[PDB]
Write a protein that binds this ligand. Structure first.
Ligand SMILES: CC(=O)Nc1cccc(CN)c1
Ligand SMILES: [Zn+2]
Length: 257
């Protein structure tokens, strides 16, 4: 099964998922000097005040905080998007060391981790139908650097002990994802894909320019999770990131000058 090891990692994924070599794969390096300011891009509209988080799950590849997406409770619109995209889950990618972990890079710089808030386009009715469409998903990507602690992340950190191994979940209600955002909503955007198998080319990426700061202790606790299930040999959940892929025939646009 696919994973992040030498024998099943990103360089192997194309054998079962040929789209891994497709025309709009993610992540990419964001070359800041060649991205283009687009004054027709609108401000991002993040409406999370009514979000209903439900559960946190170790799926063997990351941990997902899942939301009730049966109504327009936590939605992303504006920016490059047409219509309304509902939040379904967020997760992170991170490194074994502070110098790596992000999927997108900025002028080749790697951050310690990257947060993905995954949303689906409500005009397709459900996530499963949305991922059959080229505009089915919108992912808000946020870089993490190590410095001061992020208070709004601590509730996530302190439940991880209860979902150490693949397949474990815990109730995770009343979590406010607004506490994971930076101050500015200035962003880059480009058309891409999910960064995990099945690597579907459905995503409008919206990558925020401003990182959030998290403490060394917070990201250290991410690294105590396990890829394996209970009762199996322990494999620390670290370096669960896909490296940058060829940009090919795509333009990265900036919302700011
Ligand atoms: C596997 C899967 O579909 N999970 C999921 C996560 C969060 C919400 C929902 C309901 N749309 C489903
Ligand atoms: Zn992701």
């Amino acid at each position: 099964h696919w994973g992040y090891g030498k024998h099943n990692g990103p360089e192997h994924w194309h054998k079962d998922f040929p789209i891994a070599k497709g025309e709009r794969q993610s992540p990419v390096d964001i070359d800041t000097h060649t991205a283009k300011y687009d004054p027709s891009l609108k401000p991002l509209s993040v409406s999370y005040d009514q979000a209903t988080s439900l559960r946190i799950l170790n799926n063997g590849h990351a941990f997902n905080v899942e939301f009730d997406d049966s109504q327009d409770k936590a939605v992303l619109k504006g920016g490059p998007l047409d219509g309304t995209y509902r939040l379904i889950q967020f997760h992170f990618h991170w490194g074994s060391l502070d110098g790596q972990g992000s999927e997108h890079t900025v002028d080749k710089k790697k951050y310690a981790a990257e947060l993905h808030l995954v949303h689906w386009n409500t005009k397709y009715g459900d996530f499963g139908k949305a991922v059959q469409q080229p505009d089915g998903l919108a992912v808000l990507g946020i870089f993490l650097k190590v410095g001061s602690a992020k208070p709004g992340l601590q509730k996530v950190v302190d439940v991880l002990d209860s979902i150490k191994t693949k397949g474990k979940s815990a109730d995770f209600t009343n979590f406010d994802p607004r506490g994971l955002l930076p101050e500015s909503l200035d962003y880059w955007t480009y058309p891409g894909s999910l960064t995990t198998p099945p690597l579907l080319e459905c995503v409008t990426w919206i990558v925020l320019k401003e990182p959030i700061s998290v403490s060394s202790e917070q990201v250290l606790k991410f690294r105590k999770l396990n890829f394996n299930g209970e009762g199996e040999p322990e494999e620390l959940m670290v370096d669960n990131w896909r490296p940058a892929q060829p940009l090919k025939n795509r333009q990265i646009k900036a919302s700011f000058k």
